[PDB]
């Protein structure tokens, strides 16, 4: 019956729409075009933190290190990096520029310093992620052009991988702290899968949007007196110059947490 309530969700919003949820307490899930690629636009920049972070359990002053910031860095939406020209700031603030106000900047430096995106995408199949796959930089990623491939993934798969970066232990216990911290942070997620939950339970998210109105939104979700949830909502439409529908992954997850 959920997912009837998804189709018809769908339907109205007229695009499409990916779900997975994973329940914690009994290792349910709801699924609903899980198996589909869509662009993953700025919800990637948890990957590539995350293998920052992975990288500081070998290197640990690594998020102590300066990068320069120069204009030549600056792309389309660079809302910490553009006060931070000519300095410097360190890994750590600009996993958390990425995470917490998707500055695409963060994002280009983080790519930059793995070694690309094809390490990020390496990086996700040494969790056992073999859908992810990121193919592009900062801001080219987002063109969410239906039909390409190229910086995807699959709702079941983001879920399956939010799952071991924030309660499973890909990362280290600092790690996976910080990553959780970092989300828990979000400036930019209030209106997308929050707006559907219920004020007093916690979320910690990552939300992207892009092309063909594509929006999307990430979630580790702690209801209160209840184990954790992991929800992923992806959403994408036929017009390339449609607009952000965060309502729709509000609806979304008012959906599948109804009952819970
Ligand atoms: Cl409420």
């Given at each position: 019956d959920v997912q009837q309530k998804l189709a018809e969700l769908e339907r109205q919003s007229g695009g499409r729409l990916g779900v997975a949820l994973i329940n914690?307490?009994?290792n349910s899930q709801i699924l609903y075009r899980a198996d589909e690629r869509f662009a993953m636009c700025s919800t990637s920049k948890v990957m590539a933190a995350a293998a920052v972070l992975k990288k500081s359990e070998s290197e640990p002053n690594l998020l102590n290190q300066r990068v320069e910031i120069k204009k030549?860095?600056?792309?389309?939406?660079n809302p910490i990096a553009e006060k931070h020209v000519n300095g410097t700031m360190s890994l750590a603030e600009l996993s958390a520029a990425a995470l917490q106000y998707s500055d695409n900047v963060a994002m280009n430096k983080l790519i930059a310093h793995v070694g690309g995106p094809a390490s990020v995408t390496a990086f996700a199949r040494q969790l056992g992620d073999e859908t992810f796959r990121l193919d592009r930089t900062?801001?080219?990623?987002?063109?969410?052009?239906?039909?390409?491939?190229?910086?995807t993934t699959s709702p079941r798969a983001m879920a399956q991988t939010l799952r071991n970066l924030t309660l499973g232990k890909a990362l280290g216990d600092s790690q996976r702290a910080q990553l959780v911290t970092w989300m828990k942070g979000?400036?930019?997620?209030?209106?997308?899968?929050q707006a559907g939950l219920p004020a007093s339970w916690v979320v910690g998210d990552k939300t992207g949007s892009g092309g063909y109105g594509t929006t999307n939104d990430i979630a580790v979700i702690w209801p209160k007196d209840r184990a954790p949830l992991i929800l992923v909502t992806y959403f994408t439409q036929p017009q390339p110059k449609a607009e952000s529908r965060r309502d729709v992954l509000a609806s979304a997850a008012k959906i599948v947490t109804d009952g819970l």
């Open positions: 914690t307490a009994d030549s860095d600056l792309v389309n939406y900062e801001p080219t990623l987002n063109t969410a052009i239906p039909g390409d491939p190229r910086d979000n400036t930019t997620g209030a209106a997308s899968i």
